[PDB]
Amino acid sequence: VSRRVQALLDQLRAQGIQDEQVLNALAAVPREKFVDEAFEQKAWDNIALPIGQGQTISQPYMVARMTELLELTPQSRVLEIGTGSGYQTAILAHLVQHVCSVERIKGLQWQARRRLKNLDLHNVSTRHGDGWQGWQARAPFDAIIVTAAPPEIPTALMTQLDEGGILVLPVGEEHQYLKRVRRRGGEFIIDTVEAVRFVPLVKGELA
Numbered sequence: 001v002s003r004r005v006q007a008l009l010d011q012l013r014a015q016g017i018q019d020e021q022v023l024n025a026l027a028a029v030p031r032e033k034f035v036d037e038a039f040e041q042k043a044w045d046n047i048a049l050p051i052g053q054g055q056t057i058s059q060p061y062m063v064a065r066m067t068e069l070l071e072l073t074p075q076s077r078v079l080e081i082g083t084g085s086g087y088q089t090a091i092l093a094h095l096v097q098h099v100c101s102v103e104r105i106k107g108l109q110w111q112a113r114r115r116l117k118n119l120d121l122h123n124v125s126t127r128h129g130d131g132w133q134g135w136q137a138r139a140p141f142d143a144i145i146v147t148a149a150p151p152e153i154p155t156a157l158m159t160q161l162d163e164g165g166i167l168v169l170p171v172g173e174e175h176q177y178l179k180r181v182r183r184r185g186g187e188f189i190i191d192t193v194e195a196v197r198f199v200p201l202v203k204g205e206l207a
């Protein structure tokens, strides 16, 4: 593993990431493939970077943290909202049996699908759509992860959780916090994790 890669991993560990499976997945996904050639030198810096349409690839720490919170196993059926570059999608694909991923901007969904195909990842289903609606046909899910921030928790994304299912998302506008929602019998339990700042999860009209 390259110097820049081990530098990132060490930084993430120092920042409290403990799941070595998640770190191993991070190491195995060529992050540079997910940003423009112009950002090649900084592709492994622990920062967000511009991707195709006013959107950004998330900071590797935030990716690791959110991925940890989902408590994934190789049996997990996962729903991801906000494919973007496909970077987080690729990470999840290394960890679980199947990932379904929804992106509202057709241009991004299309490029992401190709990238994942190019990485020999065959356990991913991608969709151009509005993730406020989840993906009912593929439901329920053991884990749902949202990489854009709605002002409220989308109802469908609780409904589509299986028993013991975990939803992880940033919530808010002026004040955003990362939240974990767990389905437990007749109840959902909502915990607050940390402060964050994401682009909004945009409702309806597909870009």
Ligand SMILES: Nc1ncnc2c1ncn2[C@@H]1O[C@H](CSCC[C@H](N)C(=O)O)[C@@H](O)[C@H]1O
Pocket: 051, 055, 056, 057, 058, 081, 082, 083, 084, 085, 086, 087, 088, 089, 102, 103, 104, 105, 108, 129, 130, 131, 132, 147, 148, 199, 200, 201, 202, 203, 204
């Ligand atoms: N309603 C919606 N449904 C699906 N995706 C949405 C959405 N609103 C915003 N998004 C998308 O959420 C993404 C936030 S950037 C996500 C980064 C991505 N996880 C990666 O690794 O590259 C953007 O691509 C944006 O288009």
